[PDB]
Design a protein around this ligand. Structure first.
Ligand code: SAH
Ligand code: M3L
Length: 424
């Protein structure tokens, strides 16, 4: 099979992890390394359990020689260093383990500059930069503040590469479902759209892993990494995406600018209803607009004319009105703004959806395939959003704004009220 692999298995055997009780051998699959069922496994069947003696979370780093120095360090930062450190030591308890870990994945955090050009104009590109940058800073402060001072615990130099390496390992191997644990045995389980549950972790401490699906002898055992992540998210966290167009999403960012003459009043209204000065609305393909998006858009484009709704008089129904619409000038404004943002964003890509779809029709490199699928999806969402507001511009007169809703109770045609009045 593989050097460190055929050995890594041996390692677990003595640690009382892998026995003739566990029906699942590690194998080389299209997704790298994975768990192949050694024999017909059933639903919920615990495939393998690992002794907490083998975890690699904050609790294990706090108990090692670097447990002190990393005392005030944040959760991940502690594990980053720990992982790096153990990778160096030739007598580490995870010796056969690290010889198994992939030096890299297809996460965009590793993409070359050319590779990154394939995501030009994409939201994913932005996000990946930000993340790469941040991690960098936090990793440089660790060197200058922990790695270098304690030249006794960290003998070897630590490069950025090693950092991103450890980070990636975290982002693609941590089970934050119990918040940042790692399990050398159940670390080799891959993701599959076949699984639609999203609950496999367990603990009897101990880490118990159970296959949410009945696998036959020879086949691979999978799990659902996260039913709620977008493709842009699966792309960064792990190095893969799904064909499922329902994973395509595009998040819009809304904010009440401080230069807005009604900033103070608008922010009070927003906060009073669960929204901050800045708000993110995730828009998924074929899914309906998120609640709050429209009323927040209306608040943003409020304007002098409708500013009267910001008065103490409505501080109890203003949001209800925002949900029902303010006025035609208000609706037209936000539509205009949204459509313009969509068209502007659409122009930022270097390929058309037609080209992307044709590309997908041939054989693509894993990272090329990700960029293509990611950018095609984003264009679909942007165009769906644009489609939605284009319709809105047309039905701009079918909505019953504030004024009209206010006059829907005039009772013009009532009684000859004067008769009653002239009776006293
Ligand atoms: N469905 C899938 N398609 C492609 N790669 C996958 C995948 N599920 C898991 N992976 C890969 O495996 C990582 C999760 S850790 C799983 C073990 C991994 N196969 C290994 O050889 O070490 C992901 O970040 C990704 O690079
Ligand atoms: C790749 N590996 C299987 C190790 C983890 C995949 C992500 C699991 C997710 N954090 C959850 O706990 O629900």
């Amino acid at each position: 099979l593989s050097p460190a692999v055929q050995t890594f298995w041996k390692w677990l055997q003595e640690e009382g992890v892998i026995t003739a009780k566990t029906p699942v051998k590690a194998s080389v699959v299209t997704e790298g390394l994975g768990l192949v069922a050694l024999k017909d496994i059933s639903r919920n069947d615990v495939i393998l359990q690992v002794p907490k003696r083998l975890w690699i979370n904050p609790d294990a780093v706090a108990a090692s020689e670097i447990g002190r120095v990393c005392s005030e360090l944040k959760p991940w930062l502690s594990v980053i260093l720990f992982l790096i450190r153990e990778r160096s030591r030739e007598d580490s308890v995870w010796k056969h383990y690290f010889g198994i870990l992939p030096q890299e994945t297809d996460s965009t955090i590793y993409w070359s500059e050319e590779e990154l050009q394939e995501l030009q104009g994409s939201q994913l590109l932005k996000t990946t930069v930000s993340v790469k940058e941040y991690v960098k800073n936090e990793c440089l402060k660790l060197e200058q503040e922990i790695i270098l001072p304690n030249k006794r615990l960290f003998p070897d130099p630590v490069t950025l590469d090693d950092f991103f390496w450890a980070f990636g390992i975290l982002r693609s191997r941590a089970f934050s479902r119990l918040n940042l644990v790692v399990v050398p045995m159940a670390d080799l389980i891959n993701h599959s759209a076949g699984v639609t549950t999203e609950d496999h972790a367990y603990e009897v401490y101990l880490f118990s892993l159970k296959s949410p699906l009945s696998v036959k002898a020879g086949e691979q055992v999978y799990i659902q990494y996260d039913l709620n992540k977008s493709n842009a998210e699966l792309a960064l966290d792990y190095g893969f995406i799904e064909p499922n167009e329902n994973r395509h999403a595009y998040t819009l960012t809304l904010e009440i600018s401080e230069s807005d003459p009604f900033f103070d009043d608008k922010l009070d209204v927003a906060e009073s209803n669960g929204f901050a000065q800045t708000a993110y609305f995730d828009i998924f393909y074929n899914r309906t607009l998120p609640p709050g998006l429209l009323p927040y858009l209306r608040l943003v484009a409020l304007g002098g004319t409708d500013a009267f709704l910001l008065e103490s008089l409505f501080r109890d129904t203003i949001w209800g009105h925002l949900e029902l619409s303010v006025s035609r000038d208000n609706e037209e404004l936000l539509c205009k703004a949204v459509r313009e943002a969509c068209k502007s964003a659409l122009a930022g890509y270097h390929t058309t959806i037609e080209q992307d779809r044709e590309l997908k029709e041939g054989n693509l490199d894993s990272r090329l395939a990700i960029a293509v699928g990611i950018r095609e999806g984003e264009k679909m969402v942007l165009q769906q959003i644009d489609g939605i507001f284009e319709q809105k511009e047309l039905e701009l007169d079918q909505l019953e704004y504030y004024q009209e809703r206010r006059l829907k109770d005039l009772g013009l045609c009532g009684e000859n009220g004067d008769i009653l009045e002239n009776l006293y």
